[PDB]
Design a protein around this ligand. Structure first.
Ligand SMILES: CO[C@H]1O[C@H](CO[C@@H]2O[C@@H]([C@H](O)CO)[C@H](O)[C@H]2O[C@@H]2O[C@H](CO)[C@@H](O)[C@H](O)[C@H]2NC(C)=O)[C@@H](O)[C@H](O)[C@H]1O
Ligand SMILES: CO[C@H]1O[C@H](CO[C@@H]2O[C@@H]([C@H](O)CO)[C@H](O)[C@H]2O[C@@H]2O[C@H](CO)[C@@H](O)[C@H](O)[C@H]2NC(C)=O)[C@@H](O)[C@H](O)[C@H]1O
Ligand SMILES: CO[C@H]1O[C@H](CO[C@@H]2O[C@@H]([C@H](O)CO)[C@H](O)[C@H]2O[C@@H]2O[C@H](CO)[C@@H](O)[C@H](O)[C@H]2NC(C)=O)[C@@H](O)[C@H](O)[C@H]1O
Lengths: 390, 390, 390
């Protein structure tokens, strides 16, 4: 039959209001405030956490403040292991109320909520990002959110910790928690190596031209939303590649200029004409390596025929010392993919190369280069096949 | 007086929680999951639909699953007609509860909800996209959402169906259901016809240069959000024009290059200088034709003085084989408008044209062209006059 | 302990549903409909307001309609003063219910809600944009939203009014009330003054080239979201500067062309080659002047090392009559900042200037220039330091 959920004779249930809050959270779960580690109240037998609020698939969870320690987690038996401190909902448990409304003594022991230590494969099997209490095909009764990596030493020591920032709704994304900016940087300058194809380092270190003869590795301001992307965990790829943590349609914006651009000088032989040199800036995706996503999670397989390379800028050098460019594209990206930018040109500097024979500021380089990567759409349902291939 | 809705002594009503959910849905109504046609359980007297959830102006509607058929709709009397299968709320009806809380027998016969067949003019008069149960000036008591076009044959046959995808919140837009991408495509190449003004085909078929002498009509990947736009229903305009289904401020992004660009060769007569050729890429809107929107709905009239053409790129060819361009603009668009892109230049190839005398890859063409159209703002209230003219 | 808010044994309180609605409003408060001044029912002792709905930090407030006047505010004693008509929540007050559910006589006198006149410093101390009933560190019990500037004359006169549009959720932003477009304009043409550095007038008046000898100040279509930005209140800066009203990560899009661009003519002395002229378009922020934000509110101090200038386009003129450009960047902006765009070039027209010696249409000018400024992210929590410096 046709059932009303919100109608005059309907009864609004806990699962109902949780389904509503989850919708209002854009289906993202996470710590809204607090719930950070309290090292002052942390011993070799207990782990303390500060007061706070979290939402786990529409269910509101609170750690209350009193007198500190706001909450204590038992670490007895945990030793020489790296574990995940998790906030878990278990709907098989029974919440035990006591006292009464009428007296001011109503209280509930929420057995459906626990703070616990899980190993990575156990967390992954019940991770909110992959499984749901509200799921249509495989509904679950137990779901978890990892808060910290906890590394226990020898019996008698206090553990080392690392916050799982993807599960904290800190700042930057509050009104649009599942979307917004994935990555952005300030303008930077980067020397173009004398090769046909090279990646542009987008993760905060550029090879900056500093003199007429030299360039040097220099930091530039960069920011990443840990819920959406991360710097590649492999050192070979760490300067250049992002790992996508969330499927979606993303928008890539790039701008900058090619400085000391090469071209064939107008001479009597070529009828006093500039001989332009072709170059292209491409964005790229690659999913050959599995388990690059956070916790080594299984990558999300893309639809058959998915793009791998997309031309953002494709033209010739125009005979000027410096030539600006800009491009904006929407692209599909999947959890586990590598995403990167490449500069392409010919390798013969006297015929087809956009780069010259100089080094440092005398050599061809990218100047005032910057980008923004932003999540703008999801790939759920039919969009996976209709929108996911490009 | 000043009335609190959500305060300590307030009573939260069904209309209240529905007004809240509608706000959380960005005022969009639609099927959240399921509610697709079940052809196995569909006969010549009954039409079956699968279990699912929908939200209609903040009211949650559910089709429950048991044992299939999840729901049955009576088709007796319906013959040789094209009808709309609609999900309707009728607040003049009375929901009849039975049983009691205390026993586990409470149940409601939701007479305020029906699955019914309506003709197009009846649906349009009570369509959620134009009328509201919550409306300030003209509040309604009956509102509908069309799910399928149902074409009934002769008495004794099973009907033909077509899903109304604009009313299904499938994928791509989940956390931002009333906004997000309207249209996007992969990079494509398109031959420039030897004319002053031409539309750029944005609906998935381009005239691709394939040899030094020929171009051929070739499909490219394109995606449209049916809630926001559709391919023009008239075959004359179908390769080039979108029909806007929803008023708003939209963002248009374009990028690509002009390949084999024409220019006046540097000769002794012009003092060995490149003679550039002017061209422009414009976006355009046109509302002269009424009833282009879904169901032949009345177009939304724009404010007096509304724009019709906007220059996105305006410059000269620079004497290079290929020259890149990019542009981003925000524009107002109205339900029923045609939206399209045009390429403009002179027609004298020896004096003012950006195009040459070649064909296929030897002729001037757009290369690596792509666009994104996205809804970024609404045109309700004062924004209609202040923001709606440009 | 671990407390559930939305669980099976939980009791959902008024503060709970208000916290949920505030989340659904992206933490923005404001009038959703109506609540505009009713001058027909306004006298020298009373001020009338029309029926409407507002949300103040998740609490729903309603002015009910009956028979007009929908509500009356006492103005006795108010004279020769500029005051703020405010909608205030005071949780120290007690809402007084009367009658009963069972009879159809339940009614509440909402003493926790008032319409009142406050001076600017009192409003600022309890302004919802700076303080919260839900605040973690400094929770408040009294919070206000200003609706109108009310200027009272001599005893016996009806007052003058000015709507505070930043506190009315009118149109343009309904589904994304705290984000969306801040400012946008139609294409305009602007003469480039013969100077090294100049601001580009973004607030609706451009110096339009109209003849081969003259340019004239001409209006162009522009729109600003008053919640996000305003035209500079100082006449010296009013044509060029925006005042940012809300912290965040913003996206700036620019496009246009440089028409009648200057360059060194190819002559025998320079080996028949175009001598390009460097120019750059920069966006800029400046927070030296405090109290530029609405009501003269204290500016939000940026993190140490914050950017002030960012190159959007940096290149040489290419020897063409007209050269197009486009750029998209994300930038941090703070409440109280000035935001503006600048055009930069050399001042020697025979050696390094992108501008020539002409005036009007014969002189170098920006053609088809337009921009969009949009709020795309917040700067709360850790994002303030990690994302706020660029
Ligand atoms: C396991 O898959 C991984 O490898 C993908 C491909 O790597 C490129 O292939 C090699 C050689 O071409 C042949 O082995 C290069 O080392 C890789 O590309 C280079 O990466 C470095 C580091 O990021 C760049 O600085 C360099 O510019 C780039 N070289 C070229 C020629 O483009 C990789 O793309 C996958 O993402 C990854 O998982
Ligand atoms: C009923 O209004 C409809 O017509 C609008 C105008 O159509 C153009 O006008 C004619 C001729 O100029 C004179 O009759 C062209 O056929 C139409 O423009 C052309 O459309 C085709 C198909 O999309 C393009 O391939 C072609 O490039 C374009 N021609 C030119 C010169 O630009 C129409 O714009 C409204 O949208 C529509 O409702
Ligand atoms: C109180 O801080 C304010 O002033 C900031 C700087 O103003 C510029 O400085 C002077 C002179 O360079 C030296 O006093 C100029 O008058 C100001 O810049 C100019 O502003 C006008 C009006 O907007 C522009 O038309 C003009 O192009 C621009 N001049 C130059 C050379 O760029 C100001 O930036 C702060 O925002 C403001 O609060």
């Amino acid at each position: 039959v046709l059932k009303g959920i919100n109608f005059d004779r309907s009864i609004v249930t806990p699962e109902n209001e949780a389904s509503i809050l989850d919708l209002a959270m854009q289906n993202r779960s996470g710590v809204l405030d607090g719930m950070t580690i309290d090292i002052l109240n942390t011993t070799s037998n207990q782990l303390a956490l500060f007061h706070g609020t979290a939402v786990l698939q529409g269910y509101g969870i609170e750690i209350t403040r009193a007198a500190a320690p706001d909450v204590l987690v038992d670490t007895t038996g945990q030793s020489n292991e790296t574990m995940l401190l998790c906030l878990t909902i278990d709907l098989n448990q029974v919440n035990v109320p006591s006292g009464t409304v009428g007296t001011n003594t109503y209280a509930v022991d929420y057995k459906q909520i626990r703070l616990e230590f899980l190993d990575v494969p156990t967390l992954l099997k019940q991770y909110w990002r992959d499984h749901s209490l509200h799921d249509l095909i495989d509904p679950r009764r137990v779901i978890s959110m990892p808060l910290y990596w906890i590394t226990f030493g020898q019996t008698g020591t206090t553990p080392k910790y690392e916050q799982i920032k993807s599960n904290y709704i800190d700042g930057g994304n509050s009104g649009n928690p599942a979307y917004g900016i994935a990555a952005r940087c300030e303008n930077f300058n980067h020397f173009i190596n004398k090769v046909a194809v090279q990646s542009i380092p987008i993760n905060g270190v550029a090879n900056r031209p500093v003199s007429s003869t030299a360039s040097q590795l220099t930091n530039y301001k960069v920011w990443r939303n840990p819920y959406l992307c991360s710097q590649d965990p492999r050192d070979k790829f760490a300067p250049d590649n992002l790992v996508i943590e969330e499927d979606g349609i993303y928008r890539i914006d790039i701008s900058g200029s090619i400085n000391i651009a090469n071209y064939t000088f107008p001479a009597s032989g070529n009828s006093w004409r500039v001989g332009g040199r072709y170059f292209q800036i491409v964005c790229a995706r690659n999913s050959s390596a599995n388990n690059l996503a956070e916790f080594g999670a299984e990558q999300h397989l893309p639809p058959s025929g998915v793009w791998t390379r997309r031309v953002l800028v494709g033209e010739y050098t125009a005979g000027m010392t410096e030539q600006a460019f800009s491009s904006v594209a929407t692209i599909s990206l999947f959890k586990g993919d590598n995403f990167f930018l490449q500069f392409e040109t010919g390798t013969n500097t006297s015929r087809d190369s956009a780069y010259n024979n100089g080094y440092g500021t005398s050599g061809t380089h990218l100047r005032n280069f910057s980008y923004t990567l932003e999540r703008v759409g999801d790939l759920n349902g039919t969009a996976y096949y209709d929108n996911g291939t490009f």
